[PDB]
């Protein structure tokens, strides 16, 4: 189980952010669960391997580019010289996401999302696990910086025994 | 046959040349070797040098989990440095726990210091169990300094 969250502005309100959790079992050519909120209301979708499979078959090219074209998407994986627009309209709960380059665009996925009967659960959800999130990596950090300084303290040490050895 | 004399004085630089002279001499065995040492050491009074003190004695160490399996070496740990500086000062290092084993260094693990007294208390020769900070503690004074106090 792996999951993703991301920060996003949509460009029918570009002022506010929207953030968008990507969950996928193993891999993402298997399939994921795209769960879209904005502090008040979510929109949860799911994409199984057949559409993903379709969807690169329609796309006329290979499913592995594909796939990482949305990680590089989704996943926040942008790098420098690459821009998305995500457009999502609440009255028909249709999102989609294209790839702006030099005033042409590429649509590159079209996902339909169903509003979330309780988003107060989904928030608290989300809000839980990144919490989680930072207080094991955390323990982590304070862990690694407890050995280095040992191993630094041990280094010291042996090389200074090492000139009275030379020394001698 | 070589360069020294007998009728007359020897200088370091006489003595170098003479042993520039020797060729090669590698006819013997570590065991030989170590015991002509010790016996010479003894014989002239120069067991006071900073070096060759541990030379007598030989040590074993608590560095594997299980005593007498070489198997399960525990390298990445500070009793490797110790073992050694200590082999370097003279000791004589050994990976086998013998019989004629007299001396034991323990680090702060005290887990297995029965099984060491069980098997000190076994042997018709018992060896004094000693810890790591001895040692350290010793190589400064550059003596060999009492085990009461490190027991």
Redesign the interface.
Known sequence: MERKISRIHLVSEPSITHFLQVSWEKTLESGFVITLTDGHSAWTGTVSESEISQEADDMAMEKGKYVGELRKALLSGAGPADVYTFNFSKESCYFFFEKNLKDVSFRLGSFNLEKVENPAEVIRELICYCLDTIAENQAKNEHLQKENERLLR?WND?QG?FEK?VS? | CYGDSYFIDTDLNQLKEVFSGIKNSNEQTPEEMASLIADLEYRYSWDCS??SMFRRHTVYLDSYAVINDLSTKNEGT?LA?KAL?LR?HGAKVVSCLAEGVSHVIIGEDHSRVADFKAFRRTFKRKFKILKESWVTDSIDKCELQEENQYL
């Open positions: 041990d042996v025994r050895c001698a | 900073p070096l500070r440095i500086e370097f």
